[PDB]
Amino acid sequence: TPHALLLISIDGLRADMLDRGITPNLSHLAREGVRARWMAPSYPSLTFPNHYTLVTGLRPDHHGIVHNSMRDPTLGGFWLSKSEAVGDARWWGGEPVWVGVENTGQHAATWSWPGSEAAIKGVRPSQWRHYQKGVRLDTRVDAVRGWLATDGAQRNRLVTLYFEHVDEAGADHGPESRQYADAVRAVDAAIGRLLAGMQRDGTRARTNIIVVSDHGMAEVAPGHAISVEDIAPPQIATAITDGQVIGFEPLPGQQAAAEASVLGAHDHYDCWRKAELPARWQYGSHPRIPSLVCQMHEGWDALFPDKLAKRAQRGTRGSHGYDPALPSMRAVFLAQGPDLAQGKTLPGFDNVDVYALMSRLLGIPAAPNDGNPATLLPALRMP
Ligand SMILES: [Zn+2]
């Protein structure tokens, strides 16, 4: 029979965090279900590009959400809080799973998944919301609980759930901090209450569940921040993004200065013309990508000079956006329910492979994607 699918993201949950005895509910779920050793993000290892990859099966270079902050010659500027860029379907390539679900005449309900605020290929989820900071754990958990309990023609085949809490604590104090651990416990306990609730609604047993994160987290120790203008001064190029994936557009008639001073290897970063980026990143062909892309080494940030003055307090902090082959960047994948195996472990794999699993659990035809449809067949009860 057709079963519902609950898709949960715990933003910035690193893969080793399942094995520290701070996720009793997730650990139990994995033991009853399937667990990957880890799941690698796509390049760049950032929140928006990876949440969108997860639901499309496409690499960021194909789906168009190539950074958290971008420019396009036609659509203008995009960043996470410009709601009318985020809510504009023209940024978002491919076909996310909720579109596919709606196009079968079934219903999708999304708690704040990146892209779910837009009418992608003209199609919205049945239930959704604009992202709001500070929404309570038990608020979103009860909404999702209700969307899963919904009967009749309003029945949801797909429900998605997002938590920011782990990522926020990690950004502030680093991934080895007690604040990061507390946020993990808290999100884990929230999921426990969700599961218990589903047991009481009688929705648990007919619901498949996938829990993922978008990327992991690396520690950024005091003094590990430079200015983007140390990479290329404003005389020669414009920094389009800061953080860890630093995009530059040289000034007109400054190619040579830009390329002579920026390209290649430096103390704590490396830079490439976008077309010449490391092949395994599968990134650099999209026109929205700045002509020059620099990658900061793990544990280092390059910041706009105004931020650099503001922050420089002290305090261990945390960042993602590093090389997706780094252990620190590893995300989680686990799954459990009536159509998923039990007590199974899977090898490490790339996050573009989740899409094909979800298509099959949702009874939708899989759109074309960058994933390998074989990788997650073993997660199924019956391949
Ligand atoms: Zn994130």
Numbering used by the authors: 44 to 426
Could you give the paper's own sentences about this structure?
Since ENPP1 is part of the highly conserved nucleotide pyrophosphatase/phosphodiesterase (NPP) protein family, we investigated the evolutionary conservation of the analogous histidine residue and its requirement for cGAMP degradation. Two zinc ions are required for NPP’s catalytic activity, with Zn1 being particularly important for stabilizing the leaving group, whereas Zn2 activates the threonine nucleophile. We found that Xac NPP not only degrades cyclic dinucleotides but also prefers 2′-5′–linked over 3′-5′–linked cyclic dinucleotides. Furthermore, the conserved histidine is required for degrading the 2′-5′ but not 3′-5′ phosphodiester linkage.
Since the histidine (H362 in mouse ENPP1 and H214 in Xac NPP) is one of three residues that chelates Zn1, we hypothesized that the loss of the histidine prevents Zn1 binding. Indeed, in contrast to Xac NPPWT, which binds two zincs, our 2.0 Å crystal structure revealed that Xac NPPH214A was missing Zn1. We found that Xac NPPWT degrades ATP and that Xac NPPH214A (which corresponds to the mouse H362A mutation) degrades ATP several-fold faster than NPPWT, suggesting that H214 is not conserved for the purpose of scavenging base products from ATP. Indeed, Xac NPPWT degrades the metazoan 2′3′-cGAMP while the NPPH214A mutant does not, mirroring our findings with mouse ENPP1H362A. Interestingly, H214 is required to cleave cyclic dinucleotides with 2′-5′ linkages (2′3′-cGAMP, 3′2′-cGAMP, 2′3′-CDA, 2′3′-CDG), but is not required for cyclic dinucleotides with only 3′-5′ linkages (3′3′-cGAMP, 3′3-CDA, or 3′3-CDG). We also docked 3′3′-cGAMP and 2′3′-cGAMP into our H214A Xac NPP structure. Similar to ATP, the free 2′-OH group in 3′3′-cGAMP can also take the place of the missing histidine to chelate Zn1 while the free 3′-OH group in 2′3′-cGAMP is too far away from Zn1. We propose that ATP and 3′-5′–linked cyclic dinucleotides are able to compensate for the loss of histidine with their γ-phosphate oxygen and 2′-OH group, respectively, explaining why H362 in mouse ENPP1 and H214 in Xac NPP are only required for cleaving 2′-5′–linked phosphodiester bonds.
